[PDB]
Symmetry: C2
Subunit: 590 residues, 2 copies
């Protein structure tokens, strides 16, 4: 109509699916699309995990330069933080929204038409008998007037991304039920829709789109039929119930899982893997316990009683940790008055940035696996300098971004996302030991972290880039740090980052030599024993963490910890999973 | 009569030994084992010790025992004909005591059973079975000797006759004339603190005789013991074999009360003189290789390891001067230093168990004669000189033994690496060695298994043995991984003291694995480091 172009200031809620077949580049492609959605469609306000899925039965330098020559949007990009989105709440509850521009169909008619598509598609795949999928859902607060307009823009975005490569579907658009059977749009109509949203500069693209939209189905035809879609939606909007559905997303999800089990004896989760991202690569949730080596610049420079920072010593230590098998380095410093009068002082920034810059330089000078760099800071300005100068990959925020929530804006650039660790604590090092009463220790901390993740996700931080840290020793008695470990299973769905290394609660476990503690100043014989015991105690927690599938463990003793993980991994590497009962029967037989 | 007939007879008896005293269970049951070896015949099978739910005079006792009239022969045996006969119900000679048939036995047993069920309306047991090749003529004579044994030791112990050959006997209203008891006893024992007043107690104590024991098939603890020793055995008076009766009793208890009767009934092994519950603690065995060197230095190292948390010390002088010269003096100095440090007498609890890593008869013999050790760690599983098995027993002492699997010697072993079914070849071998010692009278509960990591195994074979350590879930298990090459083989490449530290840490990983697999003992050089790991994992486990 003309209503499609009738420029009333609408605010709409759309749910999208983003999928690619390209394994090695799945992150780059999917995040590229995320940026294009954020630029051309509205605000990203929810995301699912990334998933590698198996079905029911390229030279990427193009992308990099594509990103520098993009047409401006006709809508303002706004990075401002939000703590709620009223239209999102309305969508979630089916609160009364404005009637659909496009004509709607009734439920029954909708169901029949979708079934027709599924049957027809099922049959074609039989004849066609002459691969991994990567999937991500997003909720978008959109300024686009209707799903046909949005699909038009989506189709434009897909074309921009071509030199399936990328597939962007619309799953929901408000509470609308729509099935438009025959769609041919003339080139000028596509132009005018595109022109309503983009400052169009270019004509090669339009042509390819003309035939590419045969029909429009909202909800997407496959919404309830493809497990991988249910799986993603279940991360984002588990309590959502659309009119066309028999139950909530969560109930539909659980029924699919349980019926796959009851009826086909298939565990559908086994072949559909949750992914998290540390830097720019896929990591499979719960498949690997990574080592994060600790670089505390204060300790490294000043614990011997010296007064100067030694950046070359610090960078050397970093190379040592890389050689010892750390996958990640966590660097931190604190503003410090190093005399007896504490007023002449060196800043956090001067502690860590020069070290990071010398590391970057020294790494570059050896092109003859770069470790992921994490920075343990709560300070906006420090993180901004690091990120602007490409010195770090991950924010490690021990306040869970409550010290300065604005730091969260630094985790998204135009063509980049950064991962973040959120830790639980109460207070600071001076007060925390007293801040120890919890109503329900395990669940208070979990609920705390979940609420922070909900806040970041609302602000367009991708769900799969957010890691949880329970903060061992930070406002927990020794027995409570243990109890948190005893109940580490409550994090089985989440990327988990823990730090037990050299903490007092380990010594609290002890009763009544090749030294693992490199002394900075001479300690008495009993303290050397205590340190050695503490480091071995933590190697015990490394083993536990291995068996509990903790994703990252943050340690001072990298060599020791890697030796433990290598042996446990080797003992787990079972060549034949049936051998043990097969060999058993054979011995009973012979 | 025909009761005291001069005929030299060889029978098979199956005994149950029971006590209520947890603190002294071992000393009491083993005292009884010794008295059974002395007064009844030869022990050729034993069960584990069990804890189930339904002292300074004893040492003195053993000094002034009256002598048996029968020989004690220690030569090793490979087989026992009469036992084979008993196991398969072959033909034996007629019972000199009158038998009853199945129906009558069952009837008379029911009567005892119900009459005892009545006597409820009107907590800890320690159990062990033994198979005895006996010179005693008949089960009634045997019961007389048994009652004597019980009086010598005295409530503190109950010794029942479970089986005696293939016989089915139910004699009621036994009255034994005071002079017959003396006469039966004198036929087996040179009768000369107790005079003849003991015989007075016994006269009332035999009221009837049931073979099989009335409760044989009715108490779980008896079935549990018998299943260890003779699972294929089927007496005429029984529905099926020991094993089936055992399995079908477990099955009843769970599908009729949701009990799972293994929660109350614990298999026990013994390292020295105390009860150890199988699979309930991972003990550390500290390694002292004397091959370090000087007595004083070596002995201070022993004290160092005790304080670091070792329950056991394993000393060896084998991987110029002799093995004997390396180890004996060290163990002598240890024993002296131990006894001096009785300034704190209260820590008589804190004496480490001592294990000697030898295959040399002469070395073990000197250790045992001088009370210098508790355990034989025989890396040949006692195949190098089986005569050493004779040293695992004294008149008032049993020693425990670790049996390890290897092939060849230190020069040849790396080449003897082919196995048809590695995990089960090694396990069956160990079971064969155990059967051999058990047949020779070594209590089953004192025998520990060791897979011999690194001895005739390639690195992947050592790992594979660890992966399948669950096959030892029923056995006391002792392993030594410490500082072995297979650990270093797991390390992913990416200087000497580097490899050394990786290896020590790689072993702490195996300590953790062993903790979770419930390995009973682990043999390590780095005692402090290992103890730290175990304390943490134990703390995590305690809710
Ligand atoms: N909600 C929707 N989102 C995206 N495409 C849709 C939707 N409803 C219908 N379509 C139609 O489906 C076709 C899109 O196919 P696409 O190229 O995305 O791969 P596909 O898997 O073959 O299709 P589909 O997205 O329907 O599964 C187009 O013709 C488009 O009009
Ligand atoms: N096979 C047997 N072994 C031991 N005692 C037996 C046997 N058959 C019958 N008895 C009789 O049972 C009594 C054994 O006394 P004991 O101290 O063992 O108490 P108990 O355990 O209650 O008896 P029982 O062992 O018969 O159940 C004696 O009177 C003994 O004659
Ligand atoms: N995220 C995180 N950071 C830390 N920084 C210092 C000490 N412990 C920790 C810790 O346990 N977790
Ligand atoms: N029982 C035993 N003894 C040993 N002696 C030396 C080296 N390894 C071992 C070992 O693994 N087990
Ligand atoms: Ca935007
Ligand atoms: Ca004997
Ligand atoms: Mg599609
Ligand atoms: Mg009795």
């Amino acid at each position: 109509q003309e209503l499609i172009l009738s420029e009333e200031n609408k605010t709409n809620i759309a749910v999208l699916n983003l999928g690619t077949n390209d394994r090695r580049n799945a992150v780059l492609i999917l995040e590229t699309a995320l940026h294009l959605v954020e630029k051309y469609l509205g605000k990203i306000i929810n995301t699912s995990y990334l998933y590698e899925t198996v079905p029911e039965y390229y030279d990427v330098n193009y992308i990099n330069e594509l990103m520098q020559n993009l047409e401006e949007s006709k809508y303002e990009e706004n990075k401002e933080l939000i703590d709620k989105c009223e239209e999102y709440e309305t969508f979630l509850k089916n609160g009364k929204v404005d009637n659909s521009i496009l004509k709607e169909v009734n439920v029954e008619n909708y169901l029949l038409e979708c079934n027709n598509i599924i049957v027809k598609n099922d049959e074609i795949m039989k004849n066609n008998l002459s691969s991994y999928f990567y999937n991500l859902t997003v909720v978008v607060k959109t300024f686009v007037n209707d799903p046909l307009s949005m699909l038009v823009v989506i189709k434009y975005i897909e074309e921009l991304m071509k030199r399936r490569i990328i597939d962007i579907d619309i799953l929901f658009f408000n509470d609308f039920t729509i099935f438009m059977k025959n769609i041919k749009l003339e080139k000028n109509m596509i132009y005018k829709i595109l022109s309503k949203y983009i400052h169009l500069e270019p004509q090669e693209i339009i042509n390819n789109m003309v035939d590419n939209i045969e029909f429009l189905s909202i909800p997407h035809v496959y919404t309830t039929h493809r497990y991988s879609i249910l799986l993603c939606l279940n991360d984002m909007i588990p309590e959502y119930k659309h009119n066309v559905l028999n139950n909530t997303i969560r109930c539909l999800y659980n029924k699919y899982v349980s019926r796959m089990k009851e009826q086909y004896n298939i565990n559908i989760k086994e072949n559909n893997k949750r992914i998290y991202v540390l830097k720019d690569r896929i990591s499979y949730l719960k498949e690997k316990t990574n080592i994060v080596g600790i670089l505390n610049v204060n300790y490294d420079s000043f614990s011997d009683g010296g007064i100067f920072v030694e950046p070359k010593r610090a960078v050397q230590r970093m190379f040592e940790m890389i050689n010892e098998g750390a996958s990640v380095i966590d660097i931190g410093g604190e503003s410090f008055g190093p005399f007896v009068i504490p007023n002449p002082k060196i800043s956090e920034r001067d502690l860590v940035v020069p070290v990071l810059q010398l590391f970057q330089k020294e790494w570059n000078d050896i092109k003859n696996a770069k470790p992921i760099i994490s920075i343990d800071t709560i300070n906006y300005n420090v993180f901004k300098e690091c990120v602007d100068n490409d010195l770090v990959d991950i924010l490690n925020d021990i306040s869970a971004c409550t010290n300065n929530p604005e730091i969260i804006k630094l985790l998204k650039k135009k063509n980049k996302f950064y991962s973040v660790v959120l830790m639980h604590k109460r207070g600071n090092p001076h007060t925390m030991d007293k801040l120890t009463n919890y109503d329900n220790l395990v669940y208070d901390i979990k609920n705390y972290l979940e609420q922070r993740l909900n806040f970041l996700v609302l602000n367009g931080i991708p769900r799969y880039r957010i890691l949880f840290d329970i903060g061992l020793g930070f406002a927990k008695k020794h027995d409570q740090s243990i109890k948190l470990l005893q109940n580490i299973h409550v994090y089985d769905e989440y990327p988990l980052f823990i730090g037990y290394s050299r903490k007092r609660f380990i010594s609290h476990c002890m009763n009544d030599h090749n030294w693992m503690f490199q002394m900075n100043y001479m300690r008495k014989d009993k303290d050397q024993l205590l340190y050695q015991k503490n480091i071995c105690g933590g190697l015990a927690i490394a083993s536990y963490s291995y068996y509990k599938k903790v994703d990252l463990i943050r340690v001072h003793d990298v060599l020791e910890t890697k030796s433990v993980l290598d042996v446990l991994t080797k003992i787990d590497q079972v060549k034949d999973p049936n051998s043990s009962s097969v060999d058993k029967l054979a011995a009973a037989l012979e």
